[PDB]
């Protein structure tokens, strides 16, 4: 059963087991059942924890439903993969990645007086090749001022840092000024449109490069696992995989009464059905009652 | 797809492009005379301009029917296409069973013959293990959990270092 | 047995989704 915070997150979900639970709930509602009350409770930390653990239940069947574009030619499968991850994030209740990680930056730095604690507390979300390049520039302006560079904006002890940090940002490879002009906006729509159309070219470059780096790392991990696997003899392979499969079955069979254990063994039985159904008619595929 | 589509019988295909299936339509003032044939069959039906607009009313909404996942089948497909590139260089192995006769036994040094028989045994090991294709479906399950945990992010499923860097410039170079 | 569905066969199988749900079911009544 769903707990009505379960089902409000699954209305915009499009995976299978979320949609059948939504449809069973609505077919319960049509047959003379009332909705329960929505909790106007659970203050901000519990609300954030609930949306964190409810976004993951929308993301986790959605990540498994997205085909990786491994071993592909052209950037259009990488753009398919990144657009599918974008759509899954939007279905799970996230915003655009830019808005969401900017919100994470502003959440981690509400206490920030200096740029040193900015560059040290957002270290988990900025790459080391950029955090070190901004740390050395903060140290270069700190050697000039001989006073701590503070996080003010109007203080030009900050601006002597920021004019070189923009140079670091343009030496990384990313156009900082069109990003600042996009998230600063403009008055007339015709002059903000021409810079949004440049920001979106940067944005497509950036998310395609991130998805491509993830795909190339998955390709390298698959090739490493295969070349370590093709060095074994066959009986070693069979007993290793059979031992791992047997241990992973017994870890879900010693779990009795947990929902994930029954779902695990039901999916094992569904895989065995798939194997039997393609053994029944191998030219037609599995039997789908349409 | 959207709930409203605006395609059909206006700038439609008036001809087919292959040699395998023959299409010709007579787009009249109201309707169309569509008559198609593909080899041994004939088909001549009548569609109106509002008959194709009713076609996108209910969507087909195709979906993959996978053994485990679409993700897992993509990783297994890449492992199969990598096993193909290893099997292609096991297809270029020189035939050692042309030198199994006793002409090559007794002309040859005993240590070099034992090395040649070890090389043949090694090719049989490599070929028995590159064609164990029932092991790729469990090899793909070792790429799946680490990848899925990397996508199960506190920020965004599609976040990466470049977007986070650009947002760090926008957060940093704007005021405070 | 034979010819299950389409909506039953569209499910990704060994996703977490229920270990996540088990943690969020044992966690939120414990943290409230």
């Amino acid at each position: 059963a769903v707990s009505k915070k379960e089902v409000l997150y699954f209305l915009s979900s499009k995976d299978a087991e979320s949609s059948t639970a939504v449809k069973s709930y609505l077919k319960s509602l049509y047959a003379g059942a009332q909705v329960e009350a929505t909790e106007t409770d659970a203050s901000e930390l519990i609300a954030q924890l609930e949306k964190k653990y409810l976004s993951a239940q929308v993301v986790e069947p959605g990540v498994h439903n997205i085909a990786l574009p491994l071993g592909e030619s052209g950037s259009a499968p990488v753009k398919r993969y990144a657009a599918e991850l974008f759509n899954l994030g939007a279905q799970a209740g996230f915003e655009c990645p830019f808005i969401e990680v900017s919100k994470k930056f502003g959440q981690e730095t509400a206490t920030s007086e200096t740029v040193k604690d900015v560059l040290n507390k957002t270290k988990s979300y900025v790459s080391a090749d950029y955090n070190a390049a901004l740390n050395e520039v903060l140290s270069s302006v700190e050697a000039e001022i001989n006073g701590p560079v503070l996080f003010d904006g109007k203080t030009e002890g900050f601006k002597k840092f920021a004019a070189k940090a923009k140079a670091v940002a343009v030496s990384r490879g990313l156009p900082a000024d069109t990003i600042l002009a996009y998230c600063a906006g403009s008055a007339n729509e015709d002059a903000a449109d021409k810079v949004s159309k440049e920001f979106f070219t940067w944005f497509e470059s950036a998310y395609t490069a991130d998805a491509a780096a993830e795909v190339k790392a998955i390709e390298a991990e698959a090739a490493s696992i295969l070349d370590r696997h093709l060095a074994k003899p066959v009986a070693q392979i069979r007993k290793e995989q059979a031992s791992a499969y047997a241990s992973l079955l017994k870890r879900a069979e010693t779990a009795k009464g947990a929902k994930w254990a029954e779902k695990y063994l039901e999916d094992v039985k569904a895989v065995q059905w798939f194997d039997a159904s393609v053994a029944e008619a191998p030219a037609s595929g599995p039997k789908v009652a349409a | 797809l959207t709930t409203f589509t605006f395609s059909g019988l206006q700038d439609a295909p008036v001809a087919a492009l292959s040699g395998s299936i023959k299409l010709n339509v007579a787009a009249k003032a109201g309707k169309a005379e569509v008559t198609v044939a593909a080899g041994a069959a004939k088909a001549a039906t009548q569609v109106s301009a509002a008959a194709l607009r009713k076609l996108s009313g209910s969507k087909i909404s195709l979906a993959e029917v996978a053994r485990i996942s679409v993700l897992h089948s993509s990783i297994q497909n890449y492992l199969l296409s990598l096993s193909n590139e290893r099997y292609q260089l096991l297809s270029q192995w020189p035939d050692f069973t042309t030198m199994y006769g006793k002409d090559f036994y007794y002309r040859a040094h005993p240590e070099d013959l034992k090395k040649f028989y070890d090389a043949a045994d090694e090719y049989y090991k490599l070929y028995e293990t590159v064609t164990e294709f029932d092991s790729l479906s469990a090899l793909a399950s070792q790429v799946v959990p680490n990848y899925a945990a990397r996508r199960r992010s506190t920020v965004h499923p599609a976040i990466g270092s470049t977007v986070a860097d650009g947002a760090f410039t926008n957060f940093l170079l704007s005021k405070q | 047995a034979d010819a299950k569905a389409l909506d039953e066969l569209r499910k990704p199988k060994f996703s977490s989704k229920y270990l996540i749900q088990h943690v969020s079911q044992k966690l939120i009544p414990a943290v409230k």
Partner: peptide, 30 residues
């Protein structure tokens, strides 16, 4: 064919750690 289930979150935003290309093509060519 099946994997262990994990319930944890990636807090960082890091580089995806491209692994080392193994020597199997050059070793089998040898």
């Amino acid at each position: 064919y099946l994997a262990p289930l994990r319930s944890d979150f990636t807090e960082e935003i890091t580089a995806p750690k491209v692994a080392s290309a193994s020597n199997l093509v050059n070793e089998w060519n040898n």
